[PDB]
Amino acid sequence: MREIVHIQAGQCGNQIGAKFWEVISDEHGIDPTGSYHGDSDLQLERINVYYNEAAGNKYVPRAILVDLEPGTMDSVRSGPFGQIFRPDNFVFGQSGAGNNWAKGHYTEGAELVDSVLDVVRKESESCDCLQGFQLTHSLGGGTGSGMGTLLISKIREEYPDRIMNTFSVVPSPKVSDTVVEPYNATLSVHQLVENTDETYCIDNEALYDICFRTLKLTTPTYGDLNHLVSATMSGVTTCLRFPGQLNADLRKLAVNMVPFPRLHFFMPGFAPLTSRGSQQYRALTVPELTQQMFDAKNMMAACDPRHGRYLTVAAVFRGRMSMKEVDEQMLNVQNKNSSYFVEWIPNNVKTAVCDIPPRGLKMSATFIGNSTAIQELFKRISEQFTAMFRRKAFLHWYTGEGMDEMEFTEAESNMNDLVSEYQQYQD
Amino acid sequence: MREIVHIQAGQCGNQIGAKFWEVISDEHGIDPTGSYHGDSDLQLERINVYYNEAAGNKYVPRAILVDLEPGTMDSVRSGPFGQIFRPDNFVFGQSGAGNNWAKGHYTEGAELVDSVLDVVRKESESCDCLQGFQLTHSLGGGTGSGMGTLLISKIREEYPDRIMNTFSVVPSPKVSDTVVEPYNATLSVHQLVENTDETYCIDNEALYDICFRTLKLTTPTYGDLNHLVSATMSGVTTCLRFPGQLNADLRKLAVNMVPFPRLHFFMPGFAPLTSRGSQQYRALTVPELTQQMFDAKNMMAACDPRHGRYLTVAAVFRGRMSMKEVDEQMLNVQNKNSSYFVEWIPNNVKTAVCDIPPRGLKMSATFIGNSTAIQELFKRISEQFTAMFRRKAFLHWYTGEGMDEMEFTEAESNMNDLVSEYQQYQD
Amino acid sequence: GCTIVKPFNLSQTYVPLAQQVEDFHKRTPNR
Amino acid sequence: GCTIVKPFNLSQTYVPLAQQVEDFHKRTPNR
Amino acid sequence: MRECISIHVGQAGVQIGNACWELYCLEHGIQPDGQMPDSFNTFFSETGAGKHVPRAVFVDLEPTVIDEVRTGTYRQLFHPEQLITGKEDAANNYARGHYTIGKEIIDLVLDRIRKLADQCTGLQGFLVFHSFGGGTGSGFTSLLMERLSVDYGKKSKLEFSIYPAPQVSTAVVEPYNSILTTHTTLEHSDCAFMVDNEAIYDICRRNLDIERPTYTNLNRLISQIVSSITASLRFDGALNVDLTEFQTNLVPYPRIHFPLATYAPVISAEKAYHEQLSVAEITNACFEPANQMVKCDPRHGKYMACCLLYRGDVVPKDVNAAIATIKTKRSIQFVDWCPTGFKVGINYQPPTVVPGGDLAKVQRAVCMLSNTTAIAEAWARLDHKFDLMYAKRAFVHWYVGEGMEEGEFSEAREDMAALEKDYEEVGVDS
Amino acid sequence: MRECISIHVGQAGVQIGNACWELYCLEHGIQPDGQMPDSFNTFFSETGAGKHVPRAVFVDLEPTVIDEVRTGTYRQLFHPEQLITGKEDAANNYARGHYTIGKEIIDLVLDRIRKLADQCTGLQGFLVFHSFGGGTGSGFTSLLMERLSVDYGKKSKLEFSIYPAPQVSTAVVEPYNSILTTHTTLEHSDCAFMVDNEAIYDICRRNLDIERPTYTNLNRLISQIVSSITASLRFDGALNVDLTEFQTNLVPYPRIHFPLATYAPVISAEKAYHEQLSVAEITNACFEPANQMVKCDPRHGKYMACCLLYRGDVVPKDVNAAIATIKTKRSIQFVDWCPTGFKVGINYQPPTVVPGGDLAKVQRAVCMLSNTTAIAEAWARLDHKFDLMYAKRAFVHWYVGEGMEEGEFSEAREDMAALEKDYEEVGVDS
Ligand SMILES: Nc1nc2c(ncn2[C@@H]2O[C@H](COP(=O)(O)CP(=O)(O)OP(=O)(O)O)[C@@H](O)[C@H]2O)c(=O)[nH]1
Ligand SMILES: Nc1nc2c(ncn2[C@@H]2O[C@H](COP(=O)(O)CP(=O)(O)OP(=O)(O)O)[C@@H](O)[C@H]2O)c(=O)[nH]1
Ligand SMILES: Nc1nc2c(ncn2[C@@H]2O[C@H](COP(=O)(O)OP(=O)(O)OP(=O)(O)O)[C@@H](O)[C@H]2O)c(=O)[nH]1
Ligand SMILES: Nc1nc2c(ncn2[C@@H]2O[C@H](COP(=O)(O)OP(=O)(O)OP(=O)(O)O)[C@@H](O)[C@H]2O)c(=O)[nH]1
Ligand SMILES: [Mg+2]
Ligand SMILES: [Mg+2]
Ligand SMILES: [Mg+2]
Ligand SMILES: [Mg+2]
């Protein structure tokens, strides 16, 4: 009954993935050994969405861990919750991809990928009715980006009627940690455009801003950043995992949020978010959550929503709440902020409510916005790509892996077209 | 009531034989002294299938141990369970055969064999209704191959209406330990074609692969390899030894699996097979066993079943299981993998179920597949034979034992014909 | 519309034994 | 169909007493 | 797995190597007898029980320098067959190194290398240590590099070179050797870190408050840089850089593989107490000309790529801040065809310090590897030096005697001219 | 049962035999007086109580070498009647060995052999030790071999021969003796292991770090090879090889019965500690020309069959891996008429080492016996040497004096020419 198959590719993908798994096990009352020690029958009712049931009262994540480096795998296995994963679901190379999309997509990744495919087929067979796939990774490196994209293509070929979801961490120029990021992102974005049904645009810069400005966190770590992402991920699939008053799964969300096939790049947000000191001076109420969610400072993509228009927003609420209140608050936001919403899609807001709140909170919210302002993110990337590509800088490495210049030209064109399309509907 | 007479010829045959005996005694609750110390009345009900009852609450294997070397015999007698065997059932030469099929078949073996024949006649007389014979050996050496074949011929002449079964370990080129293997195999295969009713093709290479890849066993030994073979052997005759819901003995299996007289070369498999670490993350269920059994990686012959077609498969299940579930899983496999099954034999799968599972497991499965892909095994061997025979390399030794070139020509022809026949039915 | 490249003009197998051995075991056959 | 051999052209009893004694005992008669 | 094989050629190479191996031992807790009372495997093979052997080959054409190693403190660390010695040196003559004397020993060394490489299951590549000026360091190394390139092919080769100074030159014929080795270095090396003794001396006097720094002081410092490079393989932290990764980031064009290395902070025990050596500070200090390992002016050049390799108590956020700060500094200019020129590595292990060393123990350190056009200035001065001597054919006869041809010299000079021109070109904006 | 009878002929044969018997005693725990405070029966008869006697006959035409044995440490090991000595030697003259002097002692030795053989109940065959160059080692052995062939017939005869070197030759007339013995060796021997002193010397200097290796060093090494061959009979392990088995595997054609033996690892106590002597490594070392027991180049020849005999802590799987690796090495080529050329033996007992020996104690060792066309080169040089001297009829008169005919020389040369030609033929691909 509606199983989701999880895939983690490259370092970032793996690490965020681990965080996701940790949170989800806690949520469903699963301990580090795979045993259920929860309180409520609701925690086990839909456990099969994310876990396979093994012999002797144990649950195992329907998760595939992929990397061209074994170090990441080791790190995962040695982590808290590392032992919950199926040993046969770790699919690792020995060499690494050296921040080269071509190595990940055509060379080392190519050699690797068949094992992964074999694993995932088995994982699909195990599930009674697989609704689809969730891939966590980055676009700026070699494995997550090149290998990940390749894997996606393969998956879609075999499961063309299943939902294909990605949580893609994009490279920003402020927090620019690598040199060839523009290339890797460009190449991967293109592929994503044709083969994913929904893509959550996660930005490290935005995460840092959230941590520093909103959470008041003097020294955020990648772990802290990852936590935010994990929360968002959990939010989307709450309707699949628990009961509720109005329920929307991955498909229902896509259908309401994607009016044209290409426009499936979301700016996610999560609410509430408070400092430890500033927690006592707040109101645990729906109007507050709503206020938080639509704010530009709470979006996990480095784009100003006020620089574009919202095509659609999907809001997913968790906790015991008044439907009327939710409906009023959502109508108010669209009436007051009329100019930030496209006028040819009346009721730009879709609402879903799950009765089970996350741990520690009485209410929570997850926001998925399809904004034409996401073009900003792509534009910067394009610019950076151009800057390098004009002089053919670092191209030789990629060509050594069998790549041609023409592919670069194609990818760039494709991305530009995508950008244009977004602009068109923005008006 | 349906006694089986066991024969072990040459080193490999002896060693695997020993393993087989050890497992079987454990299964039937027999200790190293021959005394029954089991729990259940079912363990003694059909004890007479493999054991003769001696004076004073003791059981002795209906086993004949044959070798041209006494070292092997010594090794057996000194082993754990060595003392259970009848002293008069050890029939040994002093010289050895020096990896020469001719010495085993025409010379030393000829001199030896009459003693063996005398023993086996007595063993037949002892049994009330002997259903037939099981011979364990290899085709690549001199004793097991030449002497063994000779013995088989003799046996069949005297017992033409009895079932003649062999567990034959074939030489592979990857794990090629001897030089004249091609010759010995070729000569013996020919003889087997005319005189055995069913032949289990056991391959050392495949065993190693199983051990390394599936069992995750860093340093497999021949003992470990032998264990697998023993398990398979036990599987086939479970229906003769215990009760069940649907029962198939050696004859019933042959009749369902062999549509034409020559095509009696099986690729065996055994399920389940797990590592010690990966045991906790699995499901003890029939669909899983089924999944394991039909996999190419779990076949004990170095042939890809996807390179041919299945003429028939016989599956023997042990443990308390739902017949419906078994029937559904077997139909599913044939419907989904339609292209790997010959279309002119509807319901290519025969099922048998024994209620008594092996020790340590709640359920187990033994697979016997008659695949046209077995031609690959023969083809390689043929090629190697040709490579040597074209230059008459090492022939002089064989001719010194009375052999002529013409025999070689005949054997090669015969094997080729067999290969052709398999190809024909493959289509 | 699209990028145009003008490039400046510049002046223009073994395997380890251990590795091989390892491959002999941990290499998956086609199957 | 069948192999054809072309061979290159190259350049072209006692028993121990103890053994005998042993045979005298451990040799099985025809009977 | 992930092994790196170290080759130490000639006196300079040997002496740097000694320091390096002292440092590695201290880092992995391996005693001078090979015993250790895991990651160390990147540098050491392990045999039997309580023995670790360096993945290294030491070569010189004369016995004297290696003989010290045999007699000395680390005699039990290396097995005798890894320490290879001829009878007569190359006498500051490239020809003798590459041809006359080198042809007698090269095969043997190659065989040993092959044996060593067979023992390693995940070979990352080679670290080659040698001087540019000596007959062995130039001629022999050049020969060796060719052979290695042939046999192994696509394996990464990284060479650490003691490039000759502008002023402080110890031999007369240095420019000849330097020019000749450079020609071969171009085609057979994947990345080359040039280092200048004069610069190191200045650093020791200015930053470490050492009146009289000797070669032992230089070598220790040099070893630290190597450690920083290989720490990403020998430990693990938040952000990691493999050798291939490094190459991808740092090398924009095949011939332009000459990064300058700089290390920070280099401070005395007493001087360091007062300083508040933050991530931002050390990063800033990296891009200052006074702390450079080669004498030359970056202010007069342009950056193409910099790798920053941090180690110890460091977090990403502050590195990012530092990078941002560096970006806004007008005196540090990057070429327009590189919108982001920073590869960043962060490793958890603080730099370990050699007992009796000149450097103080710090919570954080950094090694910056930067490809700047400014290094071309060194080549220009060296070329000029070469050109004077060649104008008179001074010393040329010697080289000819040992089988070298005059045409080779000219060829080599031409190659270097072409390289300088290439470097100029990449510099210019559009 | 499974006995092997050892015959030691002339000085060389005697001295090798001494070493062999020292080694056997140590292996079976038999003291030099025959007392042992089972498998040893393959080499020893047992008498009464606390006495074991070697299944061996020692023969020389002069008393000096055997006299040492009588006086020496192992005087009680052998009974006097097994040590047979004449008065005058064959004086490096084949004729004297085979005819003039040999005809006086041959009957006696045969009688003793027969007596010895009557005591053994499962005779596997004979191990014959002798030099090719000496008058006794050639002439007497040849005669003896003929007689043995006549009397016993189908019994396997294995001869271990000190074949003369290319350079390092001690006598002038060696080529004559060598040629003459070879003729008879062809028809009456089932397998012949040629060995070259020069090669052994090189091995001792290079691999064992011995400045000055003497005959005692060679002999010890040689004995080890014999032990490896017979360990399959004297112990038991996972995979076993009998003598007949060995013959079947290693000998493709009746005349082509000249395998080269090589042993691995041969290392010093100190040098070995550092090395990680794996199964793969030792196997690889077997197929290298530098570790060969005969001076010649396998790279210029082709392999027809190799037997690999492992001993000690060894498992099948890793042997298989090693074999696979060897297969993929382009520089080691096997003839096309042998798709698999590997017979493999594995025995559980590690090699025991003689107190005060040159070799270090290892967990695993290997003896490779390989039939390669490359050995034909030795014959070519020897033939060439023969041809020069015969051109002048130098020394021929001596042989004639002792009853030899000139026609025999020519016949012998022809036989060797034919053999070389045969070896060439088998080599070529189709
Ligand atoms: N939000 C997070 N960002 C991360 C994390 N780890 C890395 N990153 C960011 O992602 C980029 C580095 O990506 P990766 O290490 O994942 C590249 P990958 O291992 O997938 O392929 P390779 O090229 O083979 O290393 C860079 O922008 C990092 O700063 C993480 O845990 N969380
Ligand atoms: N799976 C197993 N294979 C074995 C075992 N023992 C040997 N073998 C394999 O069989 C081949 C060697 O065969 P044998 O020792 O049985 C030859 P046999 O003794 O029957 O006759 P001889 O020619 O007289 O030695 C070879 O491929 C070995 O690698 C065993 O216990 N298990
Ligand atoms: N940094 C450093 N430089 C050194 C050291 N020893 C020598 N040099 C420099 O190396 C160059 C001289 O080359 P050497 O390495 O001594 O010569 P070589 O390689 O042995 O060559 P030949 O002796 O000519 O065969 C000069 O530039 C020296 O300043 C050292 O220990 N450290
Ligand atoms: N490896 C080895 N070779 C030896 C030894 N003693 C002699 N040789 C070699 O044997 C050859 C000489 O033959 P010998 O065995 O001394 O002569 P012989 O068999 O006693 O014959 P005559 O004295 O002529 O009757 C030369 O090639 C010597 O190098 C030894 O102890 N070990
Ligand atoms: Mg990575
Ligand atoms: Mg046997
Ligand atoms: Mg020097
Ligand atoms: Mg003598």
Two tokens, residue C11:
């002046």
Q: Is E402 annotated as a binding residue?
A: no
Distance CA C17, CA D2 (A): 40
Tell me the C-alpha to C-alpha distance, in Å, between residue E243 and each of E36, E191, E286, F46.
27, 10, 21, 68
Query: How big is chain B, counted in residues?
Result: 427
On the question of a common fold for A1-259 and A260-373, the answer reads: no
Class for the domain spanning B260-373: alpha beta
Distance CA E144, CA E142 (A): 5
Two tokens, residue F323:
């074999």
Q: Are A395 and A187 in contact (CB under 8 A)?
A: no
Q: D29: helix, coil or strand?
A: coil
Distance CA A350, CA A303 (A): 22
Q: Are F339 and B388 in contact (CB under 8 A)?
A: yes
HSE-CB for A359 with a 13 A CA cutoff: 11
Q: Are B8 and B82 in contact (CB under 8 A)?
A: no
Rounded-to-5 percentages of helix, strand, coil across chain A: 50, 20, 30
Query: What is the widest separation between alpha-carbon atoms in chain C?
Result: 53
Q: Are A68 and A108 in contact (CB under 8 A)?
A: yes
Two tokens, residue A285:
């109420």
Distance CA E144, CA E152 (A): 12
Two tokens, residue B304:
């890809």
Distance CA E115, CA E120 (A): 9
* Binding-site entries of A for Mg(2+): 69
Nearest ligand to the C-alpha atom of residue E91 = 3
Chain B residues whose CB is inside 8 A of the C25 CB are 212
Give residues with Cβ within 8 angstroms of C3, minimum separation 6: A385, A386, A389, A390, A409, A412
Question: CA B270, B306, F318 angle in degrees (round to 5)?
Answer: 60
Two tokens, residue E430:
């559009």
* DSSP-derived secondary structure for E44-73: EEE-SSS-EEESEEEEESSSHHHHHHHHST
Tell me the C-alpha to C-alpha distance, in Å, between residue E34 and each of E381, F209, F305.
45, 22, 42
Experimental method: cryo-EM
- Looking up tokens 């054809």 gives D4
The alpha-carbon gap from E294 to the nearest alpha carbon of chain A, in Å, equals 25
Beta bridge partners of A268: A368
**Ligand 1 neighbours by CB, cut-off 6 Å:** A 10-12, 15-16, 68, 96-97, 99, 138, 140-144, 169, 171, 177, 204, 207, 222, 225-226
Edge-first strand listing for the sheet containing F83-85:
F83-85, F56-60, F4-9, F125-131, F156-163, F191-196
B309 backbone dihedrals φ, ψ, rounded to 5°? -135, 150
- Looking up tokens 């996350």 gives A358
CB neighbours (10 Å) of residue F61? 26
Query: How many angstroms separate the alpha carbon of residue F145 from the centre of ligand 4?
Result: 18
Q: Are B168 and B134 in contact (CB under 8 A)?
A: no
Give residues with Cβ within 8 angstroms of F162, minimum separation 6: F12, F16, F130, F131, F132, F133, F137, F195, F196, F197
Q: Are B5 and B130 in contact (CB under 8 A)?
A: yes
Chain B residues whose CB is inside 8 A of the A56 CB are 280
PDB resolution in Å: 3.3
Report which residue type is found at A140: G
| Nearest C-alpha neighbor of B168 from the set B386, B381, B416 | B381
Q: B76: helix, coil or strand?
A: helix
Atom of ligand 4 nearest to the CA of F62: 25
Two tokens, residue F57:
């006959």
Question: How many D-F residue pairs are in contact by the CB < 8 A criterion?
Answer: 39
- Looking up tokens 């000085």 gives F11
Q: What are the start-end ranges of the E strands in E243-390?
A: 260-264, 303-312, 342-347, 364-372
Two tokens, residue A247:
């329920």
Cα torsion F176, F181, F184, F186: sign = negative
Tell me the C-alpha to C-alpha distance, in Å, between residue E70 and each of B144, E43, E46, E64, E136.
59, 20, 20, 10, 20
Report which residue type is found at E24: Y
E213 backbone dihedrals φ, ψ, rounded to 5°? -80, 130
The alpha-carbon gap from C21 to the nearest alpha carbon of chain A, in Å, equals 15
- What angle do helix axes A10-27 and A70-78 make, rounded to 10 degrees? 20
Residues in chain E preceding a C-to-N separation beyond 2.5 angstroms (breaks): 37
Chain D residues whose CB is inside 8 A of the F117 CB are 14, 16
Distance CA A382, CA A385 (A): 5
Two tokens, residue A183:
């290339």
The residue nearest atom 16 of ligand 4, judged by CA position, is F11
Give the residue on E whose Cα is nearest the Cα of F278. E119
- Burial class for E356, CB neighbours closer than 10 Å (0-12, 13-18, 19+): exposed
Two tokens, residue F236:
């038991």
F315 backbone dihedrals φ, ψ, rounded to 5°? -120, 150
Cα distance from N-terminal residue to C-terminal residue, chain E: 45
Give the residue on C whose Cα is nearest the Cα of A115. C28
Distance CA B184, CA B385 (A): 9
Number of H helices, E strands in chain E: 16, 12
Q: Are F63 and F85 in contact (CB under 8 A)?
A: yes
- Looking up tokens 């599936």 gives B214
Q: Where does B1-259 sit in CATH, by number? A: 3.40.50.1440
Distance CA E123, CA E112 (A): 15
- Looking up tokens 């121990």 gives D16
**Hey, are the CB atoms on A416 and C28 less than 8 Å from each other?**
no
Distance of alpha carbon B149 from the chain centroid: 14
* Ligand 4 pocket residue status of F138, Cβ below 6 Å: no
Distance CA F13, CA E378 (A): 71
- Looking up tokens 């179920």 gives B353
Distance CA A79, CA A65 (A): 14
Two tokens, residue A61:
């994540």
Report which residue type is found at B187: L
Q: Are E339 and E327 in contact (CB under 8 A)?
A: no
**Hey, are the CB atoms on A56 and B278 less than 8 Å from each other?**
no
> Which of the other chains make 3 or more beta carbon contacts under 8 angstroms with chain B?
A, C, D, F
Distance CA F326, CA E213 (A): 53
**Domains in chain F, CATH or no CATH each:** 1-259 (3.40.50.1440), 260-374 (3.30.1330.20), 375-430 (1.10.287.600)
Q: Where are the domains of chain B?
A: 1-259, 260-373, 374-427
Beta bridge partners of B91: B66
Query: What is the widest separation between alpha-carbon atoms in chain A?
Result: 62
Q: Are B15 and B141 in contact (CB under 8 A)?
A: no
C21 touches chain F (CB under 8 A): yes
Q: Are E379 and E416 in contact (CB under 8 A)?
A: yes
Distance CA A336, CA B426 (A): 74
C27 touches chain B (CB under 8 A): no
Q: Are F60 and F66 in contact (CB under 8 A)?
A: yes
Tell me the C-alpha to C-alpha distance, in Å, between residue A33 and each of A90, A256, F166.
17, 39, 73
Two tokens, residue B101:
């099929």
Question: CA F32, F35, F37 angle in degrees (round to 5)?
Answer: 115
- What angle do helix axes A323-336 and A286-294 make, rounded to 10 degrees? 30
Give the residue on B whose Cα is nearest the Cα of D29. B115
Q: Where does A374-427 sit in CATH, by number? A: 1.10.287.600
CB neighbours (10 Å) of residue A78? 9
| Nearest C-alpha neighbor of F333 from the set F368, F304, F306, F302 | F302
- Helical (H) or strand (E) element with A263: none
| Nearest C-alpha neighbor of F7 from the set F127, F165, F159 | F127
Distance CA F4, CA F56 (A): 9
- Left, alpha or beta for A303 (phi > 0: left; psi -120 to 50: alpha)? beta
* DSSP-derived secondary structure for F29-66: T--TTS----GGGGTEEE-SSS-EEESEEEEESSSHHH
Q: Are E354 and E23 in contact (CB under 8 A)?
A: yes
Give residues with Cβ within 8 angstroms of A307, minimum separation 6: A373, A376
Q: Are B142 and B101 in contact (CB under 8 A)?
A: yes
F212 backbone dihedrals φ, ψ, rounded to 5°? -130, 85
Number of H helices, E strands in chain F: 16, 12
B166 backbone dihedrals φ, ψ, rounded to 5°? -130, 145
Beta bridge partners of B138: B169
Q: E357: helix, coil or strand?
A: coil
* DSSP-derived secondary structure for B263-326: --EEEEEEE----SGGGTTS--SHHHHHHHHH-GGGBSSS--GGGS-EEEEEEEEEES--HHHH
A391 touches chain C (CB under 8 A): yes
- Burial class for A4, CB neighbours closer than 10 Å (0-12, 13-18, 19+): buried
Two tokens, residue A346:
């009346």
Question: CA E239, E243, E247 angle in degrees (round to 5)?
Answer: 100
Distance CA B127, CA B3 (A): 6
DSSP state of E350: P
Report which residue type is found at B324: K
The residue nearest atom 6 of ligand 4, judged by CA position, is F12
Is E424 a catalytic site residue? Answer: no
Distance CA B231, CA B205 (A): 17
* DSSP-derived secondary structure for F307-361: EEEEEES--HHHHHHHHHHHHH-TTS-B-TT-S--EEEEEESSPPP--TT-SSPP
Distance of alpha carbon F288 from the chain centroid: 20
Q: Are E429 and E379 in contact (CB under 8 A)?
A: no
- Helical (H) or strand (E) element with F29: none
**Hey, are the CB atoms on F118 and D6 less than 8 Å from each other?**
no
B118 touches chain D (CB under 8 A): no
The alpha-carbon gap from B206 to the nearest alpha carbon of chain D, in Å, equals 29
- Dihedral over alpha carbons B93, B98, B104, B110 (to 10 degrees): -50
* Ligand 4 pocket residue status of F197, Cβ below 6 Å: yes
Helices (H), E289-391: 316-328, 376-391
Question: CA B326, B332, B337 angle in degrees (round to 5)?
Answer: 130
Cα distance from N-terminal residue to C-terminal residue, chain F: 45
